[PDB]
Amino acid sequence: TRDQTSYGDEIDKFWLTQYVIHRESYDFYSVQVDYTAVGLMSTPNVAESYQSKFKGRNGLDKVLGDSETTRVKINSVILDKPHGVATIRFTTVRRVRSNPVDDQPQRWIAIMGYEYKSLAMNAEQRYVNPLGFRVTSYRVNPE
Amino acid sequence: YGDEIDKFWLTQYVIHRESYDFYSVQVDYTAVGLMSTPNVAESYQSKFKGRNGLDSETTRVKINSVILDKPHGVATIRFTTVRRVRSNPVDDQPQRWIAIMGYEYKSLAMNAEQRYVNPLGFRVTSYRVNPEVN
Numbered sequence: 330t331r332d333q334t335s336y337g338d339e340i341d342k343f344w345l346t347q348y349v350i351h352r353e354s355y356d357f358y359s360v361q362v363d364y365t366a367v368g369l370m371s372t373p374n375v376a377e378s379y380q381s382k383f384k385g386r387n388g389l390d391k392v393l394g395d396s397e398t399t400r401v402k403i404n405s406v407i408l409d410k411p412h413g414v415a416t417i418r419f420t421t422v423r424r425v426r427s428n429p430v431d432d433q434p435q436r437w438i439a440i441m442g443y444e445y446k447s448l449a450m451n452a453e454q455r456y457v458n459p460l461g462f463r464v465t466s467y468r469v470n471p472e
Numbered sequence: 473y474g475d476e477i478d479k480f481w482l483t484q485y486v487i488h489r490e491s492y493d494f495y496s497v498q499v500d501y502t503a504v505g506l507m508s509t510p511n512v513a514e515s516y517q518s519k520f521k522g523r524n525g526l527d528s529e530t531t532r533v534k535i536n537s538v539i540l541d542k543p544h545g546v547a548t549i550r551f552t553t554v555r556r557v558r559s560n561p562v563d564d565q566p567q568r569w570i571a572i573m574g575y576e577y578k579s580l581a582m583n584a585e586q587r588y589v590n591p592l593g594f595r596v597t598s599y600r601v602n603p604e605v606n
């Protein structure tokens with residue numbers, strides 16, 4: 330909509346958490362929806378390193394299928410609105426359909442830079458991102 | 473504009489209206505004033521209208537469900553509240569409720585005011601809330 334670094338605590342918090350759930354979760358049924366969302370909510374450079382694991386024969390969706398899944402769980406969010414910086418602590422629970430039960434959960438820390446860029450958008454894009462939220466920097470490290 | 477985007481303003485609205493706070497009384501009253509129509513918003517202010525407007529107590533909320541009815545702009549939110557007076561050293565016994573509301577997206581007038589709370593023009597048309605006891 331409008332060039333803007335921040336939209337408030339609650340607004341930024343929703344877009345940030347949604348992003349992590351889209352990009353760190355893997356469900357064979359929603360992969361296309363998750364894939365499309367991360368692209369629109371990211372700069373080309375940020376979207377490039379994520380789309381890489383999906384290209385070619387050994388693309389994640391081509392290899393995994395529905396043999397496994399990873400669930401995502403948000404645990405806390407720290408906003409630095411004036412700088413467009415945000416820290417996110419979350420948990421991920423993987424599974425494989427051939428094992429008895431789930432495997433041990435994994436704690437992560439996400440350091441994200443975000444903004445709201447005003448640019449042209451098509452109909453199918455108005456559904457994904459209204460305020461034009463975009464991640465300009467992303468990297469996760471173990472807890 | 474999608475389920476998640478709608479569920480956000482809805483749950484936030486239920487949290488805004490069905491709660492009670494003072495740091496946030498200057499932020500919740502103002503918040504609901506923008507996410508509501510002049511028709512369904514006077515039933516919410518009517519609670520302080522006059523001299524006897526509503527620190528001695530508090531009321532917090534936790535969302536437990538969302539179900540959506542897209543084509544109509546309605547939702548079936550189910551939440552719980554907890555009352556607490558400054559005096560009583562412990563919280564009150566929880567109570568469970570049910571609500572359905574009307575929302576729309578009509579960005580007719582928007583200023584410096586709504587960017588923080590409501591820049592997407594989320595507006596509530598209808599409201600009701602009724603309890604639930606098994």
Ligand SMILES: O=C(O)c1cc(-n2cccc2)ccn1
Nearest residue numbers: 350351354355356359399400
């Ligand atoms: O990213 C989503 O919004 C999502 C994730 C999942 N999911 C469940 C386990 C792992 C990913 C299912 C449906 N939607």
